[PDB]
Amino acid sequence: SKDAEKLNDEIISLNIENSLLQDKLTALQAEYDKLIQR
Amino acid sequence: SKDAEKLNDEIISLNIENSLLQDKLTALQAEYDKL
Amino acid sequence: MALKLLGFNQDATCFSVISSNKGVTIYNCDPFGKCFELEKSTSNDEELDFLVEMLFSTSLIAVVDKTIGASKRKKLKIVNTKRKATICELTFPHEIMDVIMNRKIICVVLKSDQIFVYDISCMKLLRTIDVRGEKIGVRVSLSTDNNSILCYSSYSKSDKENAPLNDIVVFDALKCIQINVLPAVHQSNIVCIACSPDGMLMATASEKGTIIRVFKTIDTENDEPILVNEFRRGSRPSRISEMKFNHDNTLLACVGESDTIHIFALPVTQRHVAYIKIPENAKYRIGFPKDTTNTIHICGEDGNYLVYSIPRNEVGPCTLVKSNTFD
Amino acid sequence: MALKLLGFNQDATCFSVISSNKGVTIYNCDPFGKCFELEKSTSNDEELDFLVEMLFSTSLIAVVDKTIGASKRKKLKIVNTKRKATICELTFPHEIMDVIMNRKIICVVLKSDQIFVYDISCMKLLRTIDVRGEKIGVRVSLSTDNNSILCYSSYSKSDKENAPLNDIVVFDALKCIQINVLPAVHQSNIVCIACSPDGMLMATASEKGTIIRVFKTIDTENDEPILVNEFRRGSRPSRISEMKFNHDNTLLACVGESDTIHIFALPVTQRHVAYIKIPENAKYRIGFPKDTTNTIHICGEDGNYLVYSIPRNEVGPCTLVKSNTFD
Numbered sequence: 001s002k003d004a005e006k007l008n009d010e011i012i013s014l015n016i017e018n019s020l021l022q023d024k025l026t027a028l029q030a031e032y033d034k035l036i037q038r
Numbered sequence: 039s040k041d042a043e044k045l046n047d048e049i050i051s052l053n054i055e056n057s058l059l060q061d062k063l064t065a066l067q068a069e070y071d072k073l
Numbered sequence: 074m075a076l077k078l079l080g081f082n083q084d085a086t087c088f089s090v091i092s093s094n095k096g097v098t099i100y101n102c103d104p105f106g107k108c109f110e111l112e113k114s115t116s117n118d119e120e121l122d123f124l125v126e127m128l129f130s131t132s133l134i135a136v137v138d139k140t141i142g143a144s145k146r147k148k149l150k151i152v153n154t155k156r157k158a159t160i161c162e163l164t165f166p167h168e169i170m171d172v173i174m175n176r177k178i179i180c181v182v183l184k185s186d187q188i189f190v191y192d193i194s195c196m197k198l199l200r201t202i203d204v205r206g207e208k209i210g211v212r213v214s215l216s217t218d219n220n221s222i223l224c225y226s227s228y229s230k231s232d233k234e235n236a237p238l239n240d241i242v243v244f245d246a247l248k249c250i251q252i253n254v255l256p257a258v259h260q261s262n263i264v265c266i267a268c269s270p271d272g273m274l275m276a277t278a279s280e281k282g283t284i285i286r287v288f289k290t291i292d293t294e295n296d297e298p299i300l301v302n303e304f305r306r307g308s309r310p311s312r313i314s315e316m317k318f319n320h321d322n323t324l325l326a327c328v329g330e331s332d333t334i335h336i337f338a339l340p341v342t343q344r345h346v347a348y349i350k351i352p353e354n355a356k357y358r359i360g361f362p363k364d365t366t367n368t369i370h371i372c373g374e375d376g377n378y379l380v381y382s383i384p385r386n387e388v389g390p391c392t393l394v395k396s397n398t399f400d
Numbered sequence: 401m402a403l404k405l406l407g408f409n410q411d412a413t414c415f416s417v418i419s420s421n422k423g424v425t426i427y428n429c430d431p432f433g434k435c436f437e438l439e440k441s442t443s444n445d446e447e448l449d450f451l452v453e454m455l456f457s458t459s460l461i462a463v464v465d466k467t468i469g470a471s472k473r474k475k476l477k478i479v480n481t482k483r484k485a486t487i488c489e490l491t492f493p494h495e496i497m498d499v500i501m502n503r504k505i506i507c508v509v510l511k512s513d514q515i516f517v518y519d520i521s522c523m524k525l526l527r528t529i530d531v532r533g534e535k536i537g538v539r540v541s542l543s544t545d546n547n548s549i550l551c552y553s554s555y556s557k558s559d560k561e562n563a564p565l566n567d568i569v570v571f572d573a574l575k576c577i578q579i580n581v582l583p584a585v586h587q588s589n590i591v592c593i594a595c596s597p598d599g600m601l602m603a604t605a606s607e608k609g610t611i612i613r614v615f616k617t618i619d620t621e622n623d624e625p626i627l628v629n630e631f632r633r634g635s636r637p638s639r640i641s642e643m644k645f646n647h648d649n650t651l652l653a654c655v656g657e658s659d660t661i662h663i664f665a666l667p668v669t670q671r672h673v674a675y676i677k678i679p680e681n682a683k684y685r686i687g688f689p690k691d692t693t694n695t696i697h698i699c700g701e702d703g704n705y706l707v708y709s710i711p712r713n714e715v716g717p718c719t720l721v722k723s724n725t726f727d
Binding site: 040044047048050051052053054055057058059061062 | 128129130131132133151153160161176193194195196363364
Binding site for chain 2: 015017
C-alpha cells in the first residue's frame with residue numbers, strides 16, 4: 001500500500017530529528033553545566 | 039488498514055516527543071543566556 | 074518473590090510486567106516478543122516499581138518510581154523505548170497512585186485525590202481537580218479514543234454525618250467541562266471504575282454489594298442519570314480489581330479476588346454469560362483487542378499469558394486458544 | 401542564465417531544481433505542486449547552490465552550499481521543509497562533491513576522495529574511507545532500499561606506472577564490511593556509476609568506451625565477479641551523466657551529452673530497446689517510480705517535465721503521457 005509506505009518513511013524522519021535534538025539537548029545541558037561550575 | 043491505524047498512532051507519539059524536546063530547548067536556552 | 078504488579082495496555086497490544094528480578098519488561102502479543110526492557114535501577118530485593126501506563130503501541134511510556142521512597146511520590150518520566158532517553162521529568166506535591174493516558178489527554182492521580190489534566194501535545198496543565206479539597210482511595214477511569222472522557226468517584230453531601238462515601242462524576246477533560254454528576258450509586262465504597270473506549274458507558278464496583286452497575290455517560294438525560302443493567306455477583310461477595318469494556322460495548326470483563334472471571338453481555342444492540350476459571354490466590358489482568366470481538370487476552374502473575382475465545386450463544390466457559398509463558 | 405543544476409529524488413517522487421533567480425525550488429510529480437521553496441540566500445546572479453540530496457517523500461533535506469566560497473566546502477545542513485529549521489550542521493575538512501542518502505545510511509563524498517558513512521538514526525560516523533589515501537573525480541552510487549550497499553570507483557595497482565586509474569569496489573555500508581573488489585573493468589576512467597534499488601546490480605560508464613557493463617553486486621561468486629551484459633553505444637561515443645535501475649531490475653536508463661535517451665532491458669528474468677529523443681545542448685535527468693514499470697519520469701533544464709511510456713515488445717520509441725512546465 002503506497003500510503004502505508006509513506007507513513008513508515010515519515011516515522012524514520014521523525015525519529016531522526018528527535019535523536020538529533022536529544023543529542024543537541026545533552027550537548028547544550030553539559031556546556032551550561034560546565035560554565036556554571038567554573 | 040489496521041496497520042495504517044497503528045502507524046498513525048506512532049506518528050502522533052513522535053510529534054509529541056518533537057513538541058516536548060523543542061520546549062526543553064527553549065527552557066534551557068534562556069537559562070544559558072542569563073549565566 | 075513472584076513477578077507481581079502487572080499493567081495492561083489500552084489497545085490490548087501488549088502488557089506491562091514488573092519482573093521482581095530486575096527492572097520492568099514489556100511484552101508484545103502478536104507476534105509475542107520482548108518489546109522493551111528497563112535496565113537496573115535497584116538496590117534491594119523486594120522494592121518494586123509500581124506505576125506504568127503506556128500509549129497504544131508506541132514508544133511513549135509513562136514511568137513513575139523505582140526506589141521505595143527516594144524518588145517515588147514526586148516523579149514522572151516520559152521515555153522513548155527505541156532510544157531509552159528521558160524527555161520530560163515532572164514533579165508533583167504528593168504520591169502518585171494511578172496514571173491513565175490516551176491520544177490527547179494525560180491524567181495523573183495523586184494520593185491526596187488530586188487529578189492533574191494535561192494536554193499531551195505541550196504538557197500544559199489544563200486543570201487541577203481538588204476532589205478531597207471539596208468534601209480506601211479514589212478510583213479513576215478514562216476513555217481510550219478521542220473525545221476522551223474522564224470518570225472519577227467523589228464524596229457525597231454526608232461528610233458531616235460520616236467520613237467516607239462514594240458517588241460518581243462524569244467529566245469532559247477535552248474542554249474541562251463537568252458533564253454529569255451521578256448520585257450515591259452504592260451503599261458502600263467504590264473499589265474500581267471502568268469507562269468504555271468510546272466514552273459512552275461506565276461501570277461501578279462496590280466493596281459490600283459486589284453488584285456492578287452500568288450508567289450512560291454523556292447522552293443521558295440531564296434530569297436523571299439512566300441506569301442500563303445490573304449483573305449477578307455469584308455465590309459469594311468478592312472484591313473487584315479491574316474491569317474492561319469491549320470495543321463494540323457488547324461485552325464486559327470482570328476480575329478480582331475470586332476463583333473465576335465473569336463476562337457480561339450488553340443489551341445495547343443477563344446475570345452471567347462467559348466464565349473463565351482462574352487459580353485461587355493469584356492475581357490477573359484483563360484486555361481484548363480491536364481486531365475481533367471473540368478473543369480475550371489474559372495476563373497472569375503466575376507467569377502465563379493466555380488467549381481465550383468467547384461463546385456467542387452458549388452460557389458455557391471460555392475456550393483456550395493460544396498461550397505463552399513469561400520471564 | 402538558464403535554470404541549471406537539477407536534482408532527482410530516489411523514489412522518483414519529486415525533483416530538486418535550482419532556479420537561477422532565487423534559492424532553489426522543489427516540485428512534486430502527483431499532483432504537481434510547489435512542495436518546497438528555499439528563500440533568498442544570494443548576493444550575486446551567477447553564484448549557484450550546488451549539492452542537494454533528499455529523503456524519499458519526507459520533510460528531511462540535505463543541503464550544502466549557497467555562496468561561491470563563503471561556506472561551501474565545509475558545510476552540510478539538515479533541514480525540515482515544514483518548519484524551515486536547521487537541525488544539525490556538520491563540518492568537513494574538504495570540499496563536498498556528492499551526497500547520497502537512503503533510509504538508514506547517509507554518505508558524504510569529499511573532493512579528496514574521502515567517503516563519510518553515518519548511521520542516520522543518530523548521525524554517528526561509521527567509517528572514514530581514504531580511497532585516495534591508499535593509492536576527474538570519484539563516482540559513488542548507493543542502493544535505495546535497506547541492506548543499503550555502497551559502490552565506489554577506486555584506483556588500480558598501476559599508480560607507479562601512471563597517475564590515474566579506475567576499478568570498482570563494492571562495500572556493505574550496513575556492517576562496514578568490504579564485500580567485493582572488481583578489477584579494472586575499463587581501460588579508462590569511470591564517469592558514472594548506478595546501483596540497483598535492491599542492491600543486487602551495478603552499471604559502469606567509461607569516458608572513452610561509452611559501453612555500459614553490468615555486474616552482479618553481492619551474490620556474485622567470490623572467485624570472480626560475474627558480468628551480466630553490455631550495451632551498444634550507438635553511432636557516436638558520448639559522455640554519460642546519470643543511470644538508473646528499474647524496481648524490478650528489468651530496465652536501465654542512460655542519459656548524457658547525447659541527442660537521445662537510451663533504454664536497456666535486462667535478462668535477469670539486448671543492444672537497444674526504447675529511445676527517447678532529446679534536445680541537443682540541454683541536459684536532462686532520469687527517474688521512474690515504484691507504482692509501475694511502464695512510466696519513466698524525465699527532468700529537463702529547458703523548463704519541461706515529461707513522463708514517457710515504455711514499449712515492452714517494440715523497438716519503437718517511447719510514448720509521451722503527461723507533461724508539465726517549470727518556474
